[PDB]
Design an enzyme around this catalytic site. Structure first.
Site, PDB file in Angstrom:
ATOM      1  NE  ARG A   1      -2.981   0.105   3.137  1.00 48.69           N
ATOM      2  CZ  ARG A   1      -4.030  -0.474   3.709  1.00 48.69           C
ATOM      3  NH1 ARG A   1      -5.254  -0.228   3.260  1.00 48.69           N
ATOM      4  NH2 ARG A   1      -3.858  -1.302   4.730  1.00 48.69           N
TER       5      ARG A   1
ATOM      6  CG  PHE B   1      -1.170   9.531   7.037  1.00 51.91           C
ATOM      7  CD1 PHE B   1      -0.848   9.006   8.278  1.00 51.91           C
ATOM      8  CD2 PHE B   1      -2.184  10.471   6.953  1.00 51.91           C
ATOM      9  CE1 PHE B   1      -1.525   9.412   9.413  1.00 51.91           C
ATOM     10  CE2 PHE B   1      -2.864  10.880   8.085  1.00 51.91           C
ATOM     11  CZ  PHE B   1      -2.533  10.351   9.317  1.00 51.91           C
TER      12      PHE B   1
ATOM     13  CD  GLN C   1       2.122  -0.801   7.411  1.00 49.69           C
ATOM     14  OE1 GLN C   1       1.050  -1.368   7.624  1.00 49.69           O
ATOM     15  NE2 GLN C   1       2.741  -0.070   8.332  1.00 49.69           N
TER      16      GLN C   1
ATOM     17  CG  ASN D   1       5.839  -7.301  14.032  1.00 50.46           C
ATOM     18  OD1 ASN D   1       5.777  -8.334  14.699  1.00 50.46           O
ATOM     19  ND2 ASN D   1       6.025  -7.307  12.717  1.00 50.46           N
TER      20      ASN D   1
ATOM     21  CG  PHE E   1       6.711   2.587   8.025  1.00 46.72           C
ATOM     22  CD1 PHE E   1       6.867   1.889   9.211  1.00 46.72           C
ATOM     23  CD2 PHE E   1       6.876   3.963   8.035  1.00 46.72           C
ATOM     24  CE1 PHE E   1       7.180   2.550  10.385  1.00 46.72           C
ATOM     25  CE2 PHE E   1       7.189   4.629   9.205  1.00 46.72           C
ATOM     26  CZ  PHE E   1       7.343   3.921  10.381  1.00 46.72           C
TER      27      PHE E   1
ATOM     28  CG  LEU F   1       3.152   6.335  13.638  1.00 43.87           C
ATOM     29  CD1 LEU F   1       3.538   5.830  12.257  1.00 43.87           C
ATOM     30  CD2 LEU F   1       1.669   6.111  13.896  1.00 43.87           C
TER      31      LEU F   1
ATOM     32  CG  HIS G   1       5.842  -0.526  16.082  1.00 46.23           C
ATOM     33  ND1 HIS G   1       5.014  -1.253  16.911  1.00 46.23           N
ATOM     34  CD2 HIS G   1       5.060  -0.074  15.074  1.00 46.23           C
ATOM     35  CE1 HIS G   1       3.786  -1.242  16.422  1.00 46.23           C
ATOM     36  NE2 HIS G   1       3.787  -0.533  15.308  1.00 46.23           N
TER      37      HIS G   1
END
Length: 165
Positions: free
Chosen positions: A55, A60, A63, A102, A113, A122, A126
């Site tokens: 995708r 944004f 990934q 993950n 990504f 984010l 991770h």
């Protein structure tokens, strides 16, 4: 002596584009990125060598990176499945840093990504580790042939890989 760097090629419908390499903080993450070295030269034998994206979203992130084959390894761990998180001493910087997507809890995984925008919201779940050595000029091109929804007008393919130096 010096940190190991890996190069990557970006294709578009069979046509070549450029070359993007990543320094990778093999020192900050002497574990997760320690295996990528083997999964980047196909030495482990599992290497996908010639994959694509899943995708892409211009604004944004992107990934969509794995290496699942018929053999019996799949995308997760080069020496197993999942492993506890070492640390995240690496701060979130750059419009396109290298990390991993993950489950979060003790599961670094292999997924990752690109990220075309600054998304330091984010981290914390991770383990981040990596960056854009050189070739970013290409990371933008791929962020124009896609589509704000998921599908991409084109298709990203890989030609070769390994260690830059």
């Amino acid at each position: 002596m010096v940190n190991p760097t890996v190069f990557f090629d970006i294709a578009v419908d069979g046509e070549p584009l450029g070359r993007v390499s990543f320094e990778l903080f093999a020192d900050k993450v002497p574990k997760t990125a320690e295996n990528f070295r083997a999964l980047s030269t196909g030495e482990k034998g599992f290497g996908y060598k010639g994959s694509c994206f899943h995708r892409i979203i211009p604004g944004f992130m992107c990934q969509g990176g794995d290496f699942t084959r018929h053999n019996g390894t799949g995308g997760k761990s080069i020496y197993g499945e999942k492993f506890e998180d070492e640390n995240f001493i690496l701060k979130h910087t750059g419009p396109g840093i290298l990390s991993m997507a993950n489950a979060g809890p003790n599961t670094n995984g292999s997924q990752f990504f690109i990220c075309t925008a600054k998304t330091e919201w984010l981290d914390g779940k991770h383990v981040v580790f990596g960056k854009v050595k050189e070739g970013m000029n290409i990371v933008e091109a791929m962020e124009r042939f896609g589509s704000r929804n998921g599908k991409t007008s084109k298709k990203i393919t890989i030609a070769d890989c390994g260690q830059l130096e």
